[PDB]
Symmetry: D3
Subunit: 152 residues, 6 copies
């Protein structure tokens, strides 16, 4: 049957780094569900992501009212969690999360992709800090999300 992955994240905003994982994931799984686990306005926080990922048929976006990531996956039929690692810090953090998730839902596998080097230093928090000071970070954001980020 279909191999379905949930890609949980804060995504405020979604960056080219997230998008890169989504593009690579879309080749690995039959379906990728982007889970916006809820600073931004979801109604369009989800719209931005949908816009940014429109050229990929097997990807969709979902808002999830706060709950355990695994319970969200279960109710979606996702047997796979997909996560990214950009450095040692992510690794140790994602490792604990994935063990906890394994304890909570042993049937769900967490799968890892490493950041592509162009984006290994990119995170939304660093990006927001640079923009808050006028720095040009357009090369790290999807055009539409960059457009929208300006209005803030």
């Amino acid at each position: 049957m279909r191999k379905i992955a949930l890609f949980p994240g804060s995504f405020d905003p979604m960056t080219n780094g997230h998008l890169n994982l989504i593009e690579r994931s879309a080749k690995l799984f039959d379906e990728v569900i982007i889970g916006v686990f809820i600073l931004f306005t979801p109604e369009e926080k989800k719209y931005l992501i949908e816009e940014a990922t429109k050229e990929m048929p097997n990807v969709r976006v979902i808002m999830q009212e706060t709950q355990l990531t695994v319970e969200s996956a279960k109710s979606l039929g996702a047997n796979f969690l997909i996560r990214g690692i950009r450095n040692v810090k992510d690794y140790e953090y994602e490792k604990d999360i994935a063990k906890m998730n394994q304890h909570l839902a042993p049937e769900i596998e967490t799968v890892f992709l490493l950041a592509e080097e162009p984006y290994a230093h990119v995170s939304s928090s660093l990006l927001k800090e640079v923009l808050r000071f006028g720095g040009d970070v357009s090369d790290y954001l999807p055009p539409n999300i960059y457009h929208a980020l300006k209005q803030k």
Copy 2:
């Protein structure tokens, strides 16, 4: 030196990880003092922690009015500080703490135990986050503390 050890921590709440450390420490030192160093409240912790440790004759619990850990050790006559390391992050954090403590009190030794891998991913804050969303983490808490915790 006298084989007396202080095990300082928040224990908010105490996990099986802490407990594991205490059990192993009880085998090494003549006395193990658990120092609850004050959102679960102080008087509460103590009773719970005593309740969970009652089967170890050489373990006892004290509430320590906020102060330097090494001054608290001196008062109690503890010559050893017991810490646990579960990953690189703890290692670097505990290492700086131990160096500062050695500057403040060179006669006091910091001793380290590594997490027993069933609990390497376990911390009170991760447990708290998982409980918030209804996760079952009873395998990670002493029964007494789990129940008392289900009053949320």
Copy 3:
């Protein structure tokens, strides 16, 4: 991409760690190729490994002469490389290898699974050394391989 994966290694011997990654990989990929790159005999390894993974319809074992992993993958039709990470040292080593493979074959994706904590300390070279001295590591090897190991 076609869900065809290569899991490259020397597997001398294969451990429950490798087996564990193969089992989890088998839930995701249509085809998991165990690529044994040529201390037993080639024909013996293949037999041991096929025997240890016979319960999995979508796993195959293929002996390969040493060469570029991505050349092996391309010969066999694999679009994915499966790697495991048991600690920081593996992470940093695997990341360099993955980036190099990305340079050599951009169309091949390296996918990562984290060691299941019971085997996180296990590698063939720690096992060998323990075996050299009569240590009981039967918990860490497929029973067919552990038997074979004693024999010689």
Copy 4:
């Protein structure tokens, strides 16, 4: 031409570890500019630092109202950013910051010095925690900042 370095930091307060970096980079660069990228009014944080660095002719202090570090460097003709690394956490954090600053200002080079061992565990944050509790960290502070510090 002159090699000029900006040394950005919150210096809250400046410690002997900072002072050690400043002294060492004062030998490496023709000029070093300490940038207090904003307790005691920074109107005095600048004086504290100025006082502490008096015996070094090629060192200046400026308060850059918060702005992109590289923008500050550019407007001062500083083609070098000087950073310290105490540990792995520092390394990964500074590395992301240097990669972003490279993207923002490719002509500016980030240069790193390792902490000298007596100060490797020293942070303003740790010092403040110890000071809060009465601990003696006078060895970790320039005399003038220590004095100016025991008043709140």
Copy 5:
């Protein structure tokens, strides 16, 4: 359990780093055994190490032929293994070894001490590379071993 500890190593040669751990260990255990697992001949090494530790009455030196550390401990009545950590590399290495030893002998506890900063960078191998080139590392070797070492 009996506060008897084994401190296993090659001690080729024994460094002030080693000596530092032994001194600190002699304060914690009733008996510390330096297990020297076979530059110098066994008899020389034993004399060297005995000479270097003769100031500590609860320290003893035993030569041991290479074998499982935990069975050497079992033969000698040691319930504790004492190990040092000087960096992340050491931590990950000792962690795997401690987990294996725990699997081989669950009743044996491995206890860790962090390197004292002066010696954090000190290993026998590095010390030897510096020695072969004439560099003065006398500050890093007990005098008797230093003297002995500069006679060949």
Copy 6:
């Protein structure tokens, strides 16, 4: 003080990674001395390196009968050692070496540059592994060093 830096390394072969550090530090130092510590032939090494660094005025190539690095630097007038860090492994390794060099020659400063993204996974040895199997690493070597490597 005039700023002259020694860049010690094996350089078999020199990569675009090394070249990258040389270009960057040539902008920081009055003189950069490439110290080839002598499988490759030195006359070769030197000519290859000198040719790959032809159009940098303040860059000089030298080979050292091997001796302590800080001795070779003192001989040359180099008050600075320049190193690169690609990852955590490099960092811990270079940190030990730098501390040992601080101890041997406290007057000599070790200065660090972080690898830039394109080359952070590149090392001579990983390169050789790949070359030795016909992989294309021409993007990672200076063109002359690349042609000269065809023959072997």
